[PDB]
Amino acid sequence: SIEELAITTIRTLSIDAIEKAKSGHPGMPMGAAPMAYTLWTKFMNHNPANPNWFNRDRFVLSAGHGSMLLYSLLHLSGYDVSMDDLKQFRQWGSKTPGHPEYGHTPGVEATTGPLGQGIAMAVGMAMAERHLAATYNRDGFEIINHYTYAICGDGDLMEGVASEAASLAGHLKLGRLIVLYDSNDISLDGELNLSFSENVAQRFQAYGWQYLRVEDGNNIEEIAKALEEARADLSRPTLIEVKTTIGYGAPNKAGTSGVHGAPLGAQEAKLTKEAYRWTFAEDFYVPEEVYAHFRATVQEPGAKKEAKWNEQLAAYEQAHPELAAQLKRAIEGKLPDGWEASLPVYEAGKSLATRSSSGEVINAIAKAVPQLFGGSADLASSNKTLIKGGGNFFPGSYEGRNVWFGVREFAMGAALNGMALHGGLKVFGGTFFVFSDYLRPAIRLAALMGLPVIYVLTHDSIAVGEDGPTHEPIEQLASLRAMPNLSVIRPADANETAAAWRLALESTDKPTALVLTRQDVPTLAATAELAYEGVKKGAYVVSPAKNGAPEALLLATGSEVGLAVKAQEALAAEGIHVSVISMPSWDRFEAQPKSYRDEVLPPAVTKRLAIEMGASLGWERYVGAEGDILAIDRFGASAPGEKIMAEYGFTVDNVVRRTKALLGK
Amino acid sequence: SIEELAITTIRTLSIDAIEKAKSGHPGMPMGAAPMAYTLWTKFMNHNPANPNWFNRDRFVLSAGHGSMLLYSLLHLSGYDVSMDDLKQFRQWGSKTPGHPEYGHTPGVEATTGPLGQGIAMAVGMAMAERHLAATYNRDGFEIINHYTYAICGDGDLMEGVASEAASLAGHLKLGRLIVLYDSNDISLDGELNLSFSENVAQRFQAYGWQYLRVEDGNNIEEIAKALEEARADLSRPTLIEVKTTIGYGAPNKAGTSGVHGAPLGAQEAKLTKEAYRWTFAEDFYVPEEVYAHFRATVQEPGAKKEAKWNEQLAAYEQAHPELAAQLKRAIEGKLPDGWEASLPVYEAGKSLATRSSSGEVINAIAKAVPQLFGGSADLASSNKTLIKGGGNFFPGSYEGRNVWFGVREFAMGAALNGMALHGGLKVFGGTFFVFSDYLRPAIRLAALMGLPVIYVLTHDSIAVGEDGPTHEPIEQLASLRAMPNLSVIRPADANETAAAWRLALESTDKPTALVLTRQDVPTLAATAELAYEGVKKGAYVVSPAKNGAPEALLLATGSEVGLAVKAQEALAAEGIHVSVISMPSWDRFEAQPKSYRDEVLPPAVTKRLAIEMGASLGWERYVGAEGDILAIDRFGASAPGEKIMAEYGFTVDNVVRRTKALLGK
Numbered sequence A, B: 001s002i003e004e005l006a007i008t009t010i011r012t013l014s015i016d017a018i019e020k021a022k023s024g025h026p027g028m029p030m031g032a033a034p035m036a037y038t039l040w041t042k043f044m045n046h047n048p049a050n051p052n053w054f055n056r057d058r059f060v061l062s063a064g065h066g067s068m069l070l071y072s073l074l075h076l077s078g079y080d081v082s083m084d085d086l087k088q089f090r091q092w093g094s095k096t097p098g099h100p101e102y103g104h105t106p107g108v109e110a111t112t113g114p115l116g117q118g119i120a121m122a123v124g125m126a127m128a129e130r131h132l133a134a135t136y137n138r139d140g141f142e143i144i145n146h147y148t149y150a151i152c153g154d155g156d157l158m159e160g161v162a163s164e165a166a167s168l169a170g171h172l173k174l175g176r177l178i179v180l181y182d183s184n185d186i187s188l189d190g191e192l193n194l195s196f197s198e199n200v201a202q203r204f205q206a207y208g209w210q211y212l213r214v215e216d217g218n219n220i221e222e223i224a225k226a227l228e229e230a231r232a233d234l235s236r237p238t239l240i241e242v243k244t245t246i247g248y249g250a251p252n253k254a255g256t257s258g259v260h261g262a263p264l265g266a267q268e269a270k271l272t273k274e275a276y277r278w279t280f281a282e283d284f285y286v287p288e289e290v291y292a293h294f295r296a297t298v299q300e301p302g303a304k305k306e307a308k309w310n311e312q313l314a315a316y317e318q319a320h321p322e323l324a325a326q327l328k329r330a331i332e333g334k335l336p337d338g339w340e341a342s343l344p345v346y347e348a349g350k351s352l353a354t355r356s357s358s359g360e361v362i363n364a365i366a367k368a369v370p371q372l373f374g375g376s377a378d379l380a381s382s383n384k385t386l387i388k389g390g391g392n393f394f395p396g397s398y399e400g401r402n403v404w405f406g407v408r409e410f411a412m413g414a415a416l417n418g419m420a421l422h423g424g425l426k427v428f429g430g431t432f433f434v435f436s437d438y439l440r441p442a443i444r445l446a447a448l449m450g451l452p453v454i455y456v457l458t459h460d461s462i463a464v465g466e467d468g469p470t471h472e473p474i475e476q477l478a479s480l481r482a483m484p485n486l487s488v489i490r491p492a493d494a495n496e497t498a499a500a501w502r503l504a505l506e507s508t509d510k511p512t513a514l515v516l517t518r519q520d521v522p523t524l525a526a527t528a529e530l531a532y533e534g535v536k537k538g539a540y541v542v543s544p545a546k547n548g549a550p551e552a553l554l555l556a557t558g559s560e561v562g563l564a565v566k567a568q569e570a571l572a573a574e575g576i577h578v579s580v581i582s583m584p585s586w587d588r589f590e591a592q593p594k595s596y597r598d599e600v601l602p603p604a605v606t607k608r609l610a611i612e613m614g615a616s617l618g619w620e621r622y623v624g625a626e627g628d629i630l631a632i633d634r635f636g637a638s639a640p641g642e643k644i645m646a647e648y649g650f651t652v653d654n655v656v657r658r659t660k661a662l663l664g665k
């Protein structure tokens, strides 16, 4: 049968590439190839000629170690994955990295490897599909309509982020999300029973999922059957548990954890090929009949599906020209001409938390930017993230723009990544800066994939006060500044906050963390003028010395900028002139040339005090060896916030006092 | 009824404390007072006169926003929490912080606030209780035998950490763990149905838990019946869903999310006490007959119980004097005198990954230190954590010392906090450094509570190779360096690894992260002699300049110390003389006096190159303004590790070219 031979071809390309690499994970591709074959050639709607076709079904390999299965299917389907690419598995600069990397392989929809997260990112994709369908499907035109598939394994189902995401997806009745569970009773350290014994069916049923079981993971009629039932039932996400033998066919290693994560070896790979009836003498061998089978089943149907969808789009264009022009910009990642003029501008004196001015920026933008979409992990009323009038994102009204993620920071991070990968949306999530730790691995995959997600991180310091040190960030700032390709902006007032929002929405290729206060911040007088370009360049001179030549520089961020300005005013009354530097974003300031940075931090002004309510790690770069740091390198406390700040030294007097010491006065 | 009157006292005290603080969370205490009084006064075995009684039931309030419910029961029961303490809720330095703080309050077993983690810490405590029962109990002496209780809310049960922990606890059949779920259909933003609609009972049964439902959370008899059923089924852990009205008794605010986290206000407070029939008209008032009731239900029974256990203990001493002697030492936190003699010492040049030398050290410490208990998150084969011959921690064999946490990093981390809090064990957990992000919030809780937990974090760098950038740490070091009260050690070789393990085990008041390699690192010349004092001082000259007069300093950590010594050798062969500095721990170095710091880092020697395969943040502190940093501020790649390290510039020839450039040579 041609189906069997395609499946053996997949199994054997995967083995050989892993042998040549002397590295990788054979056991999962060997057992999962039939289910992956069946989904890829019989149910999934995609076009190898255009992996960016916007209405394609989205596929996610959550069990990322199995990546040679993905690459085998990509290559045989005619994606731009060549045979030489498969012979470069796990090699420097290749298009077949050991775990799936989005942006490095055509057709790969998401970077996985960190277990659990792929499922949750698929949930994100399925949410973007329903929200987009409800925004653009009008008057008989079903322009957004597609499934989200994922293959996961035992480890994915032990990770909490996948529990969070399954709960959320079932709650939202995401009927177009179908997960195939590679259920092989094996994890990395040995038998599944070492660590895991849940009734997975009963658990996914408690979330509101359709559960289906495949007894024989090699029987493609039982698999295709399960897939038909899953695609039929659009009222619930589906989990298809497919019982497999890890390393199926290896006479000595099938069913053992030894086959999870190291090459079969030349001896056992020979015996496996014999067990497969794979007669052929050559390695990396694909019979022409297999390329032909894949042409017939995938390449050629895929191009007609997309052609036929291009026809429906052209008619929608003519029927609904504005709506289609909006959709086309959304797909292209563009914002509506002139949206930015809708941003608020705040006068000096006006005092409100930067979480509150964030709240106002959001609603101001939300009208001008239809593509904005997001929410909070059960803190909308504290983070100030609600889009008023925007609607609740619910199965009865997927057009609603407010997502109620629940107390699931980590699912929220990864769903956000998934929505951004889908395309068509600008997306944000809110929580307390301290609990940004709960989604830390999702922030990392955003950075690695270069996804311009936006984190709304409020309650940024010890000024939080009474809820105490579990709720008071100290190190989180430093911990994000050290992450590559993560933009971090801690705006100093309402105007820097609108600037920060603007830059974050203009980002195309990296996540932005917005660090915001619980407590009021009075608006500075220069920021209305300078914030957008000032924040654009990471740091600037928000308040220059009045006598032009500063005797020392005060360096501050967020709320502390106001503190430093009031110290400046006290100091100049005494005849001591300093320049205050706002430093809303280290990463963007380091992106500028030294010509600019030297205009902000003039080398001749060696006396520099840093002022920031957070760990000191890193501050020596900017204050230098004659400078001083006023920071916090200890945990906080449970007390009114202005009192903590005082006992920790963030007072006008102590700033003046430390500045005077720097100058020998 | 005296029962009602005590329950109403709890409620009023909670309301009054929040009013006076003008901050706090009345909703949960108001709804959950009955269940907590029932557990506290009728089932828990505890002694207010000794909160450290070792065989007490352990209680954790996972829903830590309800702190005043805990402080009320502690005050009323005769723990060292005064009325003045209750009147200082949420104030500076007070014994009643806004969320419970272990070590800041008598009777408080864990710091909570961050949702989900309370349940998983309680799982760890129950794990501790069974490992210690299996170790010390003998026929006729069930000397270790007590329950673990927690109270959680809806938010706890959305958190991934509590799904992981529940799964593991069901798998481990921890029948003595009983969780009371305050099920009030409300969360912080509104109704539970915004975000959460699952069948909790069905999910928890899928884990292997017993599920019990109390329909009227004010009926203390129905609560008592569930606790009796739950305490009687020791084959499974129990979840009791207690249907409660949040803010019960407040005629306006009961059952709304506005009573979650703000004071009632004086009006609603008056109206609430009216509904309760509380007519004393004095804030912070306790009827004398309520104290007397708690003294009859808690104080006197508690002293009798500990006293009976102490009689038991002395009987156990007589019949099993050696085990009783070992038990007493474990309880008091001591290590077997002389244990450190057992640590291995490695000849120079012996070449071994520090994960493998960690493995060796682990089994050396384990043979000499019975109380060592630990495991990995499905990465024992790769982290090298297995205790050989130590047995498997299962219900067959709770005396087994190897714990299979599964792919549950965060539950692992939180459960380690639980075991350290219980007392009597030295605990560790293994996973990839890059996946330490998955347990970040529990690392923070260890630091905050000062628990000498040990993290075994292998695969520390790009040397990991073919698995790619999702698996290669970059920023993790900087992220842990910035955290208060966390010790981070990245040993240079096998001897610094031995010394690191020794210091992490010797710790009493802070956790320790061990940053270990995948790849071999040769053992340096001088570490056999210098490692212990050297790592103890955080940084030390490991290879001083041959001629005694350094032209520059090479600063390095971990596997890069090797590289630095080769460069030094090459440099010396051209007439250039540099000193090499090992810095296994920044935190330990900063704890040295300046006189010693200036001796390792002579202010005279301005020309310094730091060398570390991770983010640059904070190295300017040690290289200074005329310094240079050879670091990695980008993500990694999929390739053989050697290939990546060379492309990223960690080669002998490149360190030499940098050093010469520093010296204008």
Ligand SMILES: Cc1ncc(C[n+]2csc(CCOP(=O)(O)OP(=O)(O)O)c2C)c(N)n1
Residues within 6 Å of the ligand: A027, A028, A063, A065, A113, A114, A115, A116, A153, A154, A155, A156, A159, A184, A186, A187, A188, A246, A260, B377, B378, B379, B407, B435, B438
């Ligand atoms: C978050 C995370 N933790 C740990 C790992 C290491 N790891 C990779 S696969 C795996 C488990 C393998 O078991 P399963 O998912 O059942 O896959 P199978 O071996 O059956 O292919 C683990 C722990 C990981 N990649 N991500």
Ligand SMILES: Cc1ncc(C[n+]2csc(CCOP(=O)(O)OP(=O)(O)O)c2C)c(N)n1
Residues within 6 Å of the ligand: A377, A378, A379, A407, A435, A438, B027, B028, B063, B065, B113, B114, B115, B116, B153, B154, B155, B156, B184, B186, B187, B188, B246, B260
């Ligand atoms: C990890 C984490 N996320 C968010 C918060 C903020 N927060 C505190 S309580 C809560 C949820 C409130 O619901 P529930 O747990 O049901 O408590 P109830 O209001 O019913 O007392 C949230 C999100 C937190 N403390 N920790």
Ligand SMILES: [Cl-]
Residues within 6 Å of the ligand: A382
């Ligand atoms: Cl608040």
Ligand SMILES: [Cl-]
Residues within 6 Å of the ligand: B052, B054, B421, B422, B423
């Ligand atoms: Cl104790």
Ligand SMILES: [Cl-]
Residues within 6 Å of the ligand: B102, B103
């Ligand atoms: Cl203590």
Ligand SMILES: [Cl-]
Residues within 6 Å of the ligand: B319, B320, B321, B322, B323, B324
């Ligand atoms: Cl004995």
Ligand SMILES: [Mg+2]
Residues within 6 Å of the ligand: A153, A154, A155, A182, A183, A184, A185, A186, A187
């Ligand atoms: Mg498996």
Ligand SMILES: [Mg+2]
Residues within 6 Å of the ligand: B153, B154, B155, B182, B183, B184, B185, B186, B187
């Ligand atoms: Mg609730």
